[PDB]
Amino acid sequence: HMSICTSEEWQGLMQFTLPVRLCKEIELFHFDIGPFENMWPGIFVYMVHRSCGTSCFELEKLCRFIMSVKKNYRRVPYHNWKHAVTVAHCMYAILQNNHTLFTDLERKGLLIACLCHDLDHRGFSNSYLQKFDHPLAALYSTSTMEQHHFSQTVSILQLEGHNIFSTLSSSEYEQVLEIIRKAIIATDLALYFGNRKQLEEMYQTGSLNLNNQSHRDRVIGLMMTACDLCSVTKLWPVTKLTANDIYAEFWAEGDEMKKLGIQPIPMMDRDKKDEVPQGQLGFYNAVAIPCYTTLTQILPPTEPLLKACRDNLSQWEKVIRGEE
């Protein structure tokens, strides 16, 4: 019930090299993968090799994993392969700019987890699957999609020739999987608020301690959210464009509601388009700014994320006031 890549797909991958000019641009937090679809899987291998070294995974098994993950992202407007790699890229930048804070094991786990974090997304919110009344909400009743995504990741690992973690001890194997699980569950935005609040406090009292595993988990979680949302840290044109993609998905789920005489919340209602700038302002102020603010406090090198989010914010203020 999992989808595998073909020999063609994965071998083509092994042969790919990254054009010299992108090398510098990839290191930047605002880098946009948009213009480079062909390369996306190659871009991930590259980021892997630069994070954890060229012989951290067997190249054959790695390329097979990457290409089978691709094949399990659906052709929805926003929760797709492209989102998969963007989040992956942002975590690379974060890992690279904080290199000694994390273990080899965390850097492998987190890059993989980002790639896999929305696997087999159908373009439906957790609310929609539960609130009416899909087979997966009968199976997991909190964080529905995210438990599914992790379970997909594990199913891809368990496929013939795909287990990129096979050469770890079973202690190390069972540790990274646990890193990956927490990482993917942390992408459930509903968990983020409680998590960000804890962290905020712990930082404030000066009681945050990266040697304490439960603290560690919390920081990673925040990192996960900050990567999940990084669309808002691109340059305006890109950000604007991506907003269209996320709204296209919302509105389609709103269209499905309307089809059962149920009015969707305004966020999901394409007849409520002109409230979008306002809604974006809201989101930046209630969700994104606080995310990047706290992330910067804990990991100062991540400041450029906060800096760009601030710029997009002021772009949205400008759309509202009638000047874009």
The binding site for 3',5'-cyclic GMP comprises 79, 280
Between vectors from CA 321 to CA 318 and to CA 322, what angle results, nearest 5°? 90
d(CA 159, CA 42): 21
* Least separation in angstroms between CB 255 and ligand D6X: 15
Catalytic residue among 1, 30, 79, 162: 79
Please state, in angstroms and as integers, the Cα–Cα distance from residue 245 to each residue in 131, 134, 241, 323, following that order: 24, 24, 7, 23
CB within 8 Å of 47: residues ≥ 6 apart: 26, 88, 89, 92, 111
283 binds ligand D6X (CB under 6 A): yes
Binding test (CB under 6 A) with ligand D6X, winner from 231, 302, 312, 315: 231
282 contact choice in Mg ion, ligand D6X, Zn ion, none (CB below 5 to 8 Å, kind-dependent): ligand D6X
Q: How far is the CB of 188 from ligand D6X (least distance, A)?
A: 11
Both tokens of 192, joined, read 């983020």
Q: Is 228 in the site for Zn ion (CB under 5 A)?
A: yes
Query: Of 50 and 272, which CB lies nearer to ligand D6X in the complex structure?
Result: 272
Which listed residue (103, 275, 285, 318) binds ligand D6X by CB under 6 A? 275
Write down the least CB distance from residue 84 to ligand D6X, Å.
14
Residues 6 or more apart whose Cβ sits within 8 Å of residue 76: 121, 122, 123, 249
Nearest to 47 by CA among 78, 18, 80: 18
256: left (phi over 0), alpha (psi -120 to 50) or beta: alpha
What values do phi and psi take at 120, rounded to 5?
A: 70, 30
Contact map string, positions 176 to 205, toward ligand D6X, x by CB under 6 A: ------------------------------
Q: Give the DSSP H or E segment for 289.
A: helix 289-298
* Sign of the dihedral through C-alpha 227, 229, 231, 235: negative
Active site residue 215: no
131: its two tokens: 């609130």
Closest CA to 117 of 85, 140, 139: 85
Binding status of residue 229 toward ligand D6X by CB under 6 A: yes
Taking the least distance from each CB to ligand D6X, the nearer of 44 and 78 is 78
3-state SS, residue 55: coil
Q: Which stretch binds Zn ion (CB under 5 A): 18-26, 115-123, 205-213, 290-298?
A: 115-123
DSSP 8-state symbol, 299: -
Residue ranges for the binding site for a divalent metal cation? 83, 117-118, 228
Could you say which of 13, 43, 80, 118 contacts Zn ion (CB under 5 A)? Answer: 118
Q: Does 246 bind ligand D6X (CB under 6 A)?
A: yes
Annotated binding site: which residue ranges?
79, 83, 117-118, 228, 280
Give the HSE-up count for residue 154: Cα atoms under 13 Å, Cβ half-sphere.
15
Site string for Mg ion, 178-197 (x = CB under 5 A): ---------x----------
In this chain, which of 32, 118, 249, 253 binds Mg ion, going by CB under 5 A?
118
Q: Which of the stretches 90-98, 100-108, 225-233, 249-257 binds Zn ion when contact is defined by CB under 5 A?
A: 225-233
Contacts to ligand D6X by CB under 6 A = 229, 231-232, 242, 246, 266-267, 272, 275-276, 279, 282-283
Contacts to Zn ion by CB under 5 A = 118, 228
Q: Which residues are catalytic?
A: 79
